[PDB]
Amino acid sequence: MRVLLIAGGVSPEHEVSLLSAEGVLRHIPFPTDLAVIAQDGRWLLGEKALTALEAKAAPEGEHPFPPPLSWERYDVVFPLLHGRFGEDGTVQGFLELLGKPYVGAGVAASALCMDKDLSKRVLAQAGVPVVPWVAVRKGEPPVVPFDPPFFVKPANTGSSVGISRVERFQDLEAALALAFRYDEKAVVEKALSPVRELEVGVLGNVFGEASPVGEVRYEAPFYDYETKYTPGRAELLIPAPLDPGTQETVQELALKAYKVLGVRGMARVDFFLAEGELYLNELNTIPGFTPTSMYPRLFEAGGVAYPELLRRLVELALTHHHHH
Amino acid sequence: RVLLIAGGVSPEHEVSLLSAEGVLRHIPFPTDLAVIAQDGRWLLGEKALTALEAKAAPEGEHPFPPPLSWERYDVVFPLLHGRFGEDGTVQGFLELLGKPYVGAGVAASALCMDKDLSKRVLAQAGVPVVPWVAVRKGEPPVVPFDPPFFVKPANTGSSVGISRVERFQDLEAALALAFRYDEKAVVEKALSPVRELEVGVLGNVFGEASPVGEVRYEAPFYDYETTPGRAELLIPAPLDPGTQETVQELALKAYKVLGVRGMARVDFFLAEGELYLNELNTIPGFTPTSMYPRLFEAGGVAYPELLRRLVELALTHH
Ligand SMILES: Nc1ncnc2c1ncn2[C@@H]1O[C@H](COP(=O)(O)OP(=O)(O)O)[C@@H](O)[C@H]1O
Numbered sequence: 324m325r326v327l328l329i330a331g332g333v334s335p336e337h338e339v340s341l342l343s344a345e346g347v348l349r350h351i352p353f354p355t356d357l358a359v360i361a362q363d364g365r366w367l368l369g370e371k372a373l374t375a376l377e378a379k380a381a382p383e384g385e386h387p388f389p390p391p392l393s394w395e396r397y398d399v400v401f402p403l404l405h406g407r408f409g410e411d412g413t414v415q416g417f418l419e420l421l422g423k424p425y426v427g428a429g430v431a432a433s434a435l436c437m438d439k440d441l442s443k444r445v446l447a448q449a450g451v452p453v454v455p456w457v458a459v460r461k462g463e464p465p466v467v468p469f470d471p472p473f474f475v476k477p478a479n480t481g482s483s484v485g486i487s488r489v490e491r492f493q494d495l496e497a498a499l500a501l502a503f504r505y506d507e508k509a510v511v512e513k514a515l516s517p518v519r520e521l522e523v524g525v526l527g528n529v530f531g532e533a534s535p536v537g538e539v540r541y542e543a544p545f546y547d548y549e550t551k552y553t554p555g556r557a558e559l560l561i562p563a564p565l566d567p568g569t570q571e572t573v574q575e576l577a578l579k580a581y582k583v584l585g586v587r588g589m590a591r592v593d594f595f596l597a598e599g600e601l602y603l604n605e606l607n608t609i610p611g612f613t614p615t616s617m618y619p620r621l622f623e624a625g626g627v628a629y630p631e632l633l634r635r636l637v638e639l640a641l642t643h644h645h646h647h
Numbered sequence: 648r649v650l651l652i653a654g655g656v657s658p659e660h661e662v663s664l665l666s667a668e669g670v671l672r673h674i675p676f677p678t679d680l681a682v683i684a685q686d687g688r689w690l691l692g693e694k695a696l697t698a699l700e701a702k703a704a705p706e707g708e709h710p711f712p713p714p715l716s717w718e719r720y721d722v723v724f725p726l727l728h729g730r731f732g733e734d735g736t737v738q739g740f741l742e743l744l745g746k747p748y749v750g751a752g753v754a755a756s757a758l759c760m761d762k763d764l765s766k767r768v769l770a771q772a773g774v775p776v777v778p779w780v781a782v783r784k785g786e787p788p789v790v791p792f793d794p795p796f797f798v799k800p801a802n803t804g805s806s807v808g809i810s811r812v813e814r815f816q817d818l819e820a821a822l823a824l825a826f827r828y829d830e831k832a833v834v835e836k837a838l839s840p841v842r843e844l845e846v847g848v849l850g851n852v853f854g855e856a857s858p859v860g861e862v863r864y865e866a867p868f869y870d871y872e873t874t875p876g877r878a879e880l881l882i883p884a885p886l887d888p889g890t891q892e893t894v895q896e897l898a899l900k901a902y903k904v905l906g907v908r909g910m911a912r913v914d915f916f917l918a919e920g921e922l923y924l925n926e927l928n929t930i931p932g933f934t935p936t937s938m939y940p941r942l943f944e945a946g947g948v949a950y951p952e953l954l955r956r957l958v959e960l961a962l963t964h965h
């Protein structure tokens with residue numbers, strides 16, 4: 324049994340992916356090799372991948388895709404990549420062609436959960452409450468059916484990259500131009516203020532089990548890019564202070580969203596809490612995975628130790644590939 | 648120079664090579680052929696052309712990924728149908744190669760391949776679809792409507808594992824057959840009688856529609872068996888003008904909502920004056936009898952110009 328861990332990625336969440344791989348490597352209970360996708364799109368292997376992990380960044384790689392790995396060495400691949408090309412289904416598609424088991428959601432579930440427009444379409448169709456939104460495509464003029472404040476995002480983004488809070492219609496065009504540097508499609512959502520941000524972990528194939536519910540607090544107006552990964556700037560409350568009926572409704576909707584979207588392996592489901600109004604914000608199929616990230620600490624509070632969590636993710640991938 | 652991938656491991660293996668025979672005869676660019684054999688291994692160079700004239704490729708030489716010189720190609724034309732073809736897996740690989748490629752991207756391909764998720768997106772957008780319910784293995788089905796049913800694997804092609812179910816007590820056996828090909832199945836209300844209409848879209852997200860064509864066959868449904876001679880194509884379809892207009896409207900709107908790139912063949916159901924979108928095929932057949940190329944031919948787009956615009960749309964996006 325040997326696992327291949329792929330980290331880094333060309334996405335704007337590259338350094339975030341390397342921080343998650345350091346924690347995974349220290350505690351994974353399987354013999355594990357590291358592959359690092361550098362920012363330039365080329366791969367680092369062996370010692371050079373380890374050296375990039377210490378340097379916490381990988382601007383330039385050595386091997387172009389596909390890299391000269393013996394894929395039959397590995398029984399499972401752990402795609403620990405955040406953002407574009409990582410959790411949007413593209414790497415998962417390659418691993419499917421390769422006939423190789425891998426941790427996390429499949430091609431369709433990965434792509435769906437990374438698209439903030441299409442995931443909201445499927446979720447709303449299933450009766451899952453989401454924020455009122457509209458899609459905007461490059462070139463086509465925006466037609467927002469509601470009034471500011473807005474949150475303008477690229478449709479496929481992570482770590483709040485490219486997201487603006489817009490207060491007036493005059494500031495919309497600049498928020499659209501920013502968002503379109505990262506995607507051909509943007510979403511314009513109605514802003515919730517004030518908002519409490521709740522996050523819950525799911526584990527399992529399609530029919531998952533939920534962790535305790537946690538909460539994120541911060542000083543900035545919203546959970547922006549600078550706040551997210553600057554250590555200490557964020558604040559994780561586990562478990563979140565909620566009425567028992569609210570906690571259950573959150574775990575409820577997360578498992579329903581998980582099942583409808585056909586998610587595999589894991590996902591951190593994130594919610595908004597207005598006053599008592601719950602909205603499902605997004606699903607993240609490759610959450611941050613440092614020993615102190617929300618997802619591991621949530622299941623830590625649920626009786627699943629970090630090494631045991633990693634063990635169960637790998638076996639879930641083996642179970643789906645060789646039996647489903 | 649264009650690289651053409653054809654064959655595949657899906658039951659549409661022979662049709663894929665047949666479609667490659669059509670492309671290579673009219674594509675206006677230099678094109679090499681790489682064939683994926685039915686066993687997953689690839690065949691390259693002159694060996695691939697040998698599998699083409701042989702009309703089939705049971706076994707291949709190189710295991711995936713093939714030792715292919717990707718740097719010598721500017722665009723890749725993945726002419727693979729069904730699973731490991733139109734489902735985003737091949738598209739992901741090409742995204743990691745960094746090559747421009749023809750057709751829908753990873754997300755659009757996986758979405759249009761999933762008969763459950765595509766309906767959810769289309770229904771939320773107000774595009775009409777038939778009443779349906781998803782069924783997952785290990786969970787008992789809850790079907791709120793009455794027979795006859797169509798049971799399908801959620802990710803299938805060429806009606807593989809699809810049953811027309813006329814009795815409720817035959818639903819258990821049909822789900823079992825569909826569950827040998829996919830972990831998820833759909834149970835759709837069967838339309839009867841029904842007319843099957845098809846329309847081609849061309850363009851990145853904001854496409855242009857072809858004329859509307861109709862398939863008329865002599866089978867219980869347009870199954871895999873339906874055999875050049877059991878399915879005639881009416882081009883254009885004999886439709887009253889209002890219906891022909893709505894078909895093109897719904898086609899372009901669904902094309903836009905799903906963010907399809909390059910091309911798609913959008914198939915509809917006509918039953919008692921009501922249209923229903925059935926599925927979007929992101930890699931439609933390209934044999935000189937297939938519906939997609941002939942539809943744009945009737946609309947004034949010559950087959951070489953069709954293939955040029957497909958390649959140019961790939962280069963424009965990437
Ligand atoms: N509709 C909204 N109302 C209030 N706050 C929002 C809204 N959309 C986004 N935000 C804020 O922006 C942050 C990032 O948005 P999100 O959709 O999670 O992007 P990402 O996927 O990059 O995390 C959220 O954590 C939230 O604080």
Ligand SMILES: Nc1ncnc2c1ncn2[C@@H]1O[C@H](COP(=O)(O)OP(=O)(O)O)[C@@H](O)[C@H]1O
Nearest residue numbers: 777797803804805806835836837838841868869
């Ligand atoms: N709801 C339905 N009502 C009537 N006929 C159907 C229905 N669903 C499928 N069929 C028949 O089965 C055939 C194949 O269905 P389809 O969903 O297109 O499978 P595939 O993806 O293999 O093409 C269709 O051409 C149609 O004739």
Ligand SMILES: [K+]
Nearest residue numbers: 436437606607
């Ligand atoms: K996401």
Ligand SMILES: [Mg+2]
Nearest residue numbers: 481482605607
């Ligand atoms: Mg996110």
Ligand SMILES: [Mg+2]
Nearest residue numbers: 482483593605
């Ligand atoms: Mg978020």
Ligand SMILES: [Mg+2]
Nearest residue numbers: 805806914926
């Ligand atoms: Mg069909």
